[PDB]
Write a protein that binds this ligand. Structure first.
Ligand SMILES: CCCCCCCCCCCCC/C=C\[C@@H](O)[C@@H](N)CO
Ligand SMILES: CCCCCCCCCCCCC/C=C\[C@@H](O)[C@@H](N)CO
Lengths: 240, 242, 274, 242, 240, 274, 49, 49, 48
């Protein structure tokens, strides 16, 4: 439909750019995809090492943008912003190991996986600027899959393994492993915040943008008694 | 080495900095991109897709949330009765948040261009009648009458004859872009109002239902653009994602 | 000087980027620059106002550039590429909506069901005829829509604390299909108001009695399992409710008629149902 | 000096960063490279070399570890009896870890391409008989019969006539690459099963042994590739190297 | 053998790259080859200096990759990541002296070898990024030799010098020497982790990849009562 | 502007690298782009199904680009380049396997042994005929394989704590050879399952009685000591065990017949045995 | 990397330094400049009034 | 300024690094090299003596 | 759902008042000799 199919129209020599609504300009903004505690005490990641299952659906702002599409193929600039829980920049050296699927996931801080003869590792200080690497599009698929309507494996899909539903192993790109590089326990509680800037983005199959609160990383589950409307409301349709 | 001088922006992590970073895999070639249907290269392709406008955004009840997608044209007293009213702002908190246009308008600060709202009559084939769908330019308040509303941009929709009209909300703005009106000083950026009026009446014979429904399908025209890509307010996370 | 290994190498779009490494993925994002018959079956599409081709793409066979599996795929071409009619759903005044997962509807039906069971790999598009006959005195609208990778979410225990996952009767309901418990969020937390960005057609009863959406094969993969992976979910939902006066036909069925289009099956082994 | 701006990746040590470093010896020329036989320029040259597949990975006994390299075809009751079974996944924990293909598959995440398993009959010249070596595509479970297994990709191997067959496991996958199936959700990436069935029987005359052995020699075809070079899990160090 | 010698085959226009299985992409990933303690107390390297015999067979992940081949000729990017045992980045200046064979190995921290008039030395701080240098292929041989089936010297090869078996002096590239640069003892316990990224790699004679636990750096010795299988096992060959 | 001094300068492969220094080694890794007779001796290779040329390379003489030693090397060419038969090993049902180190097998035999003893430098390839006659009613397979730089490991005391090194009778067992105490790890901690990446041939007794592997000279050096350095180890191992019924010949010998190929000896001095 | 040497003016913020800074919006195009009357391009236009 | 990224070898003093350093005397020309007998350009000239 | 496996037409009769089911000649034999309830049911055309 047109506008001089609708009203009387004047000539508007419109030079309004569409370059900021491209997939690059929409997705090449680094957003939080994971935050890793490396605390001194506690049970979170207490031994100075941490193994993060790489999953960008843990932070809802990035997750809602990517789940606009079903399939997204992209390289990603991963930036790791490490500090303390107070935000302090302490003189601590970290190893950021990309542990791909099948590679030995580090069992401890003194693990032999940290020798990283083939795994990509970033040795950075916290006093250094936030460690920044380009990861490629690493899927065995031709796109990543925020929605996998199905099951990875075959067999009787019974309810003690319904958690495999939605689990795309073409999305499981491995474990991001972070330790403090030392045989002794680190002196500082650390927070590694992971910021992913997608680049060379191709995206397929636009989806409805998630209008419920995200609850879990692997599934599109929504609170059933707390189904909010997509937007705000009003008293009557004849008023505002 | 080569004499260099670090500038103030050194060691900052700008999250929108399009920079070159070190590749973690030195000779990795990706899985070759097969052809997948439905490639979007620009988000305005989604803005131009008519998604259901929740003009009936009254029933917050969870059993009645599907009643938000459609609104009741019924048999009237034959005046210019007010059927439905919504602001024509796609990025505003209200009826447009149900649209893909409106949710993508959450991710951008400024929008420009004409909007389409397709009104789909979903009554019987035997149901007939005329609607005055009036887009009011931003200066006009809520029109008290139909005879106040047809002074604005309006379409006469015979819905028994044409089951789908499209109200093209024309881009009529002082500014070249609108920065998403709110109930405050940003009402400067209001697109105006869209009000639905019974132009004749919902005329029904015996045996066909006396109440019908209009599904409003709002989209954007091809002249529509967005700029100043921002975080969205149309969906806030409250519960932490476990 | 550089590996051609960014994510947009195979695309048709030119990118002016900055790179300092031998990997193209290390570079910047940069900037750019009516009787339908198949098989032995025939439907009628006189009252649909067009046939929706999903994403403007006809269901072709797998491109040889696009395939990976080296085994020769079978293309039965008539015996599986044909209209398959499922059991009817009765549109009611209180009908919330139904969905059908693909090709899970047809893994137990016809030679398509046997070719889906006997082969590990499956690739087809779909001609989906959703038909709903109602009189000129009935009213109501159906959003007949194709949501690709329709991952069902649960109510999460209602409150949101329970990490429930939908059962196999809900994720893959077969040819019968499953109702929408919450059609507003499509049992997936995503609004049905935005469902028309997916390949969709309206059955507005005053306008058209049938919807014909022709869906291509949509996957990240050239082939997939027909048993595990459901490539899309067909959603037939009453946006506008069914209404009629008492005396008109209360039984308003929605019949789902499905043509697998250009079906391709690779990886022949024993018949496996799931 | 020249105005420069340090980016976020500054001062990181990426271990896979292919960078220029300062040379410790300013005009050192190396010893000239003589010609040495056996130059590998690509690890796929080793993947295409048939190494012994430990299909008989039952005897963990140290006196019986050489029994892992071969498996007993014996005289049967003449049915389709099951001789041997192994998953066709080269990077999986199991029979393929004995191969050079499988150990190089430990160093890569994703593999694509057809696999060869050469089965070498090592019985007598007088020993004769037929084997059904069936590669099952990934959807099929362990076939209960030989008549379930020949529905898959299979070869009939007359081993008294042809002492070495090669079961080409064809690359039959949904994905363009397989990321090394494990007993979990990564069984999505299973290649499927290879099962050995007595097609006729191990037929032996008097004076020749009633039990023979098959040495499976698994490799990769020329279409085989690997990507996403990773640390290996197929050999973990436990004792510290003194 | 072929695949349409085997089954019915479709045309697969296969653009699968082999560039990541080259010797560069397999070996130009920096892995730990040595870790040097410079502690405050103890007997390890207590006088603030340490002399590391350059031997990349001390860390098993790098060692198993190189012992895939018999002969490897490569330049190597050596990165030295220094920190404390807690991983702290302390303000300490180190001297990393490459001491080649025949050059004076430093007897102390105040040694005159550290004057480094001809030896390559790296003066780096721990607050600096990890000191990174390219070493050349420095062997008198045309390749390094992870396996030397023989003896360096002549004579009666008796059992009080069986340790010379396997010892290739074409692999002994000297001593990596690290000290804290000072006449006084350093204030911090230090750990210098050595990361070697091979480059311009040529490799000859593929070998069986080591399926036993490495025990000693100089020899391929294996635990005789603990001979593990090359892979995992199962109950029966007819089952999985 | 740059010394051509990387490790890949003499190679035939082009490298696009980045460098900022005058040393090419400082650069990035970058990316790229039947009767056999010798001497006075004759063997028979009718039943071997081919002759394995080690790494596809014939044992040539030393290239003048490739040599370093300025003394003129002697090439006796017939008196040392000839088939040398070692003492037989009896393949048994419990035979674990044997190895032979090269040219340690032949440093005490013939004019080759004298040329190895009298010269510091040695270079030869090898034609290795491993023969094992068995009847059509015997069975078993030998992996006859050439493992270059076959460094023997010990049991390390069994537990792994003792840093044992193998004795001179084990590292260099002479023409008799040494058995494999642990053939699964080849007495070196490396699996025999992967031994076929080395130049190998199967003596499958139903198929072939002899293995003829032709080995080139493999070293980092153009010449080496024949007494200290063993360039390779020939491994003859029963992967499939020897089996026969009682009445068939129990004595199944494996005879090792060795031709040094293009032997080259430099650095003449007194005869030194070790 | 490329051998560089930081000069004394490194990390200073000169307020009159005409430098290149990182753009916060990667593909933002501004609202097109309409013609407005009274464009001053040089302050001496005001001095002459 | 120009977007740069410091690599691991930053701020190290490699004693054999053949680098460019800042000249302490901006326009100093040396005393011109007279011809002196016995110029060695390579240490192998001494090895052959 | 058993019958649409055969040759079938979907007939919207409110929209199209006359459909034509073309029974296609699908036979083993080139001619059919008029099936009866006996051995000549070999010549059955099938069912509508
Ligand atoms: C060497 C320093 C470490 C470098 C970090 C390496 C991270 C690369 C990972 C690419 C991001 C894609 C994630 C895709 C899907 C996931 O969100 C799924 N779980 C969603 O289901
Ligand atoms: C000036 C800063 C110091 C720079 C460090 C200089 C290190 C270069 C050494 C090249 C590495 C090759 C090691 C080869 C064999 C060894 O593993 C043997 N022992 C194995 O038997």
């Amino acid at each position: 439909t047109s506008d001089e199919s609708m009203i009387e129209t004047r000539c508007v020599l419109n030079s309004h750019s569409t370059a900021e609504t491209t997939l690059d300009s929409f997705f090449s903004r680094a957003g939080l995809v994971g935050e890793i505690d490396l605390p001194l005490e506690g049970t979170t990641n207490p031994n100075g090492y941490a193994n993060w299952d790489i999953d960008i659906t843990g932070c809802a702002q990035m997750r809602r943008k990517v789940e606009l599409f079903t399939y997204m193929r992209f390289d990603a600039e991963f930036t790791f912003v490490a500090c303390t829980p107070t935000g302090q920049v302490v003189p601590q050296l970290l190893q950021y190991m990309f542990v791909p699927p099948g590679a030995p996931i580090p069992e401890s801080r003194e693990s032999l996986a940290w020798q990283t003869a083939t795994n990509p590792s970033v040795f950075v200080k916290l006093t250094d600027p936030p460690a920044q690497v380009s990861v490629p599009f690493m899927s065995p698929a031709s796109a990543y899959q925020w929605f996998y309507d199905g099951y990875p494996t075959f067999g009787e899909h019974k309810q003690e393994k319904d958690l495999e539903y939605g689990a795309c192993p073409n999305n499981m790109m491995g474990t991001f492993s972070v330790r403090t590089v030392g045989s002794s326990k680190s002196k500082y509680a650390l927070v590694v915040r992971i910021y992913m800037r997608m680049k060379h983005v191709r995206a397929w199959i636009p989806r409805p943008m998630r209008n419920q609160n995200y609850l879990f990383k692997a599934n599109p589950n929504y609170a059933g008694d707390s189904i909010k409307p997509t937007g705000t409301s009003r008293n009557a349709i004849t008023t505002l | 080495g080569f004499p260099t001088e670090l500038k103030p922006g050194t060691n900052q992590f700008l999250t929108t900095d399009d920079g070159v970073s070190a590749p973690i895999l030195p000779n990795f070639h990706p899985t070759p991109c097969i052809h997948i249907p439905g490639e979007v290269r620009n988000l305005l392709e989604l803005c131009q897709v008519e998604t259901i406008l929740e003009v009936n955004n009254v029933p917050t009840n969870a059993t009645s949330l599907m009643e938000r997608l459609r609104f009741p044209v019924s048999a009237q007293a034959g005046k210019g009765e007010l059927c439905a009213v919504f602001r024509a702002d796609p990025g505003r908190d209200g009826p447009w948040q149900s649209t893909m246009l409106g949710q993508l308008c959450g991710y951008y600060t400024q929008w420009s261009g004409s909007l389409e709202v397709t009104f789909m009559f979903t009554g019987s084939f035997m149901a007939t009648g005329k609607m005055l769908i009036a887009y009011t330019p931003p200066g006009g308040p809520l029109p008290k009458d139909r005879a106040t509303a047809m002074l604005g941009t309006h379409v006469i929709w015979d819905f028994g004859l044409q089951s789908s009209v499209t109200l093209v909300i024309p881009w009529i703005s002082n500014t070249h872009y609108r920065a998403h009106a709110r109930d405050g000083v940003f009402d400067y950026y209001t697109t105006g109002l869209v009000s639905i009026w019974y132009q004749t009446n919902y005329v029904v014979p015996i045996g066909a239902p006396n109440t019908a429904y209009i599904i409003a399908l709002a989209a954007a025209q091809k002249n529509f653009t967005m700029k100043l890509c921002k975080d969205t307010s149309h969906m806030l996370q409250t519960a932490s994602i476990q | 000087h550089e590996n051609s290994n960014s994510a947009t190498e195979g695309s048709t779009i030119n990118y002016t980027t900055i790179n300092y490494y031998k990997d193209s993925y290390a570079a910047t994002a940069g900037k750019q620059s009516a009787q339908l018959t198949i098989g032995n079956s025939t439907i009628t599409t006189q009252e649909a106002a067009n046939i929706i081709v999903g994403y403007g793409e006809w269901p072709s066979y797998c491109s040889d550039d696009d395939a990976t599996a080296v085994d020769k795929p079978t293309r039965p071409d008539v015996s599986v590429n044909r209209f398959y009619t499922l059991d009817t759903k009765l549109w009611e005044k209180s009908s919330k909506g139904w969905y059908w997962k693909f090709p899970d509807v047809l893994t137990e039906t016809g030679v398509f069901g046997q070719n889906a069971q006997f082969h590990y790999l499956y690739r087809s598009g779909f001609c989906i005829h959703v038909q709903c006959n109602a009189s000129k005195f009935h009213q109501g609208a159906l959003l007949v829509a194709i949501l690709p990778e329709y991952v069902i979410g649960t109510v999460a225990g209602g409150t949101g604390t329970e990490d429930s996952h939908p059962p196999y009767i809900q994720t893959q309901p077969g040819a019968d299909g499953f109702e929408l418990q919450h059609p507003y969020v499509l049992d997936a937390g995503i609004p049905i108001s935005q469902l028309t960005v997916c390949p969709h057609q309206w059955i507005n009863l005053r306008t058209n009695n049938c919807a014909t959406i022709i869906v291509p094969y949509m996957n990240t993969l050239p082939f997939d399992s027909a048993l595990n992976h459901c490539n899309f979910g067909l959603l037939v939902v009453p946006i506008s409710p069914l209404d009629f006066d008492q005396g008109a036909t209360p039984v308003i069925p929605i019949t789902i008629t499905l043509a697998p289009m250009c079906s391709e099956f690779a990886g022949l082994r024993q018949a496996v149902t799931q």
